[model samples]
Target: MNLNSIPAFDDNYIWVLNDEAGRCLIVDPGDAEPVLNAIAANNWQPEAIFLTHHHHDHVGGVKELVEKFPQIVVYGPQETQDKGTTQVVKDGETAFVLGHEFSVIATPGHTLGHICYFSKPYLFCGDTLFSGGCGRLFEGTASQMYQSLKKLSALPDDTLVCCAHEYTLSNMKFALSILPHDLSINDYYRKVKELRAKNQITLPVILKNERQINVFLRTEDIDLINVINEETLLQQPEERFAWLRSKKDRF
Candidate 1:
């Protein structure tokens, strides 16, 4: 299968996962125009769509999609029903698309109904987890987001983080501000900056590389905790997650 991106809005990405025969599956297509164009250009057949949350940016294009292709199965949590989820998936359940099984991981933080779709080496995390930053807590608490991220981080290190946005450059900046001395963060930040400078996409990040860049994924690193403590003390791992999020919210 091949995973490609069609960027929309300001920085959002509409991911296209297709097989050799152009049997396509879409992920978080906020707008249909671009995807429609792709389908027309490639003569692709969309069999399924996956939504990670109920946010307008993530679910806005679903209605149009259903209207265009009634047979396309839109898979999401219950919150996405009004937007058009033919199948509502919860944690631990498996969603079959294009003959591949995608396990649902209920990651409720960006929204109470947010969920991630995972198959080997591919994770459509939506806004719950970004490359160097996580999403703002809109509906769930710090603990909820923290636990959600911890669960996501536990996946295979090689899993591709096919999240919904291209916020990597800005996220890396925030991470660098907190840990300027960290080598991994520094190196990746430089690489991402160079990539963004040329208008390149920096998504579908490797899980192990993300662990090196994201402060939330580095709670065990005392040096990071020490840097984070300089601003506010973290009593627990979850506390660090919350503190970093709060800090990023302001940044």
Candidate 2:
């Protein structure tokens, strides 16, 4: 369970899951410099790279890392091949690395081929799910985005969501704007404000806490429905989610 969130290009966190065996699993190697330095500093071997999507900011450093560690396996979706993805995995397929198994779940919203790696307590969800917000709809429809969010949130309540960004502050701002009276949201927002003021990372959020605070996870709340449709319920679940995402985009 030992890990480090290596900070990379503005606001991005490149996660490294390391163990006592001198090997580590890398997630989102957007830049090789930081990861290279981290590995060299710890004198560890890079066993594998688990990519969530094909975004440049997520896989930009793949080629360089592959050159450095030719024996390491690169696991990701189809679009990730150009960046040295050795195995193109799909939903229900399990990826084994560093003596552990991670189940791959297809969560196509931010990108049509986005996938998340989940184990018992850790969920390297990439950009699909954030602390108090979700990824933007780039290639997938609103319905797809809603379904993807539901799929990930359905994990155990104690699951730790290791998302790839430091966007809690802005997301919490929007949440407070829409849910002014929600105690859970307010409490998280306050704590996040304190954390960010001192340049702290606010991630690896628990699924149970996200259920209570994240507006994207609470689309059916009366406050959110009122903000979206003036207190009237939407006929379709995705419609409510779509409207909320639209508002967040303009917020």
Candidate 3:
């Protein structure tokens, strides 16, 4: 299998998973034009569409794509009512695509019905986990978001996190401000800065690297806990996560 990205809007990344056999599956294609162009360029047929949530930027292109490829199967969370969704999946369920099994993991923080696709070393997390940050608590509570993140953290260290946006530099800046003394944060900040300066996408980050650099994922660390406690009354991991999420809202 080969994975490629089609940049859409300003920062969104529409991931395309190809089986290298003139067939491919698309993930969170907000716009159909780019995906259509990719399909034409690669001479590949659309076999499936996987949605992570009901966000406009993630599901807006479903109808058009489905119209273009009527035979393609559409898979998504139960809350999604897109006309193309042929399969309504939930947590612990698995969807087979391109000879690969994508286990669904319900992650409710950005949206109550948001889910992620985990297939071995590859994790296609729509908006739940970013490079040096996590998604904002748009619909769900902080506690729910924290637990969801914890579940993702339990994945293997070498897991490749395929987030849906190009927010690495901005997230790294926030991480540096929160943990200035952290060498890992400092190093990653510099690296991401350089990459962004060169107009490159700093994505598909390693889970282990995120565990070290992402402040959101480090809520359990003593340094982050102390920092949160010093600035606010927050103590537990969930509380810290809540506070940090609020801080990022204004960031």
Task: Summarize candidate 2's per-residue lDDT along 73-126 as a digit string, tens digits.
Answer: 899998787877999999999998878899999998999999999988999999
State every prediction's TM-score relative to the real structure.
0.98, 0.96, 0.97
The local lDDT score (0 to 100) that residue 46 gets in candidate 1 is 88
Sort by lDDT, top down from the best: 3, 1, 2
Tens digits of lDDT, candidate 3, 4-122: 99999999999998986878989999999999999999998899999999888898899999899998889999778654578998999999999989999999999999999999888
In candidate 2, the residue pairs with backbone N, CA or C atoms under 3 Å apart (3 or more residues apart, or in different chains) clash, namely: 226-231
Quick one: ranking by TM-score, best first?
A: 1, 3, 2
Better of 1 and 2 by TM-score: 1
Clashes of each: 0, 1, 0
In angstroms, the error of model 1 at 209 is 1.1
User: How much is 200 displaced in model 2, in angstroms?
Assistant: 0.8
Candidate 1 lDDT, 133-177, residue by residue in tens: 898999999989989999999999899999988999999999988
Error of 2 at 136 (Å): 0.7
lDDT of 1 at 174: 95
- Candidates' lDDT values, in order? 0.90, 0.89, 0.90
Q: With candidate 1 superimposed using the best TM-score fit, by how many Å does residue 127's alpha carbon deviate from the native?
A: 0.2
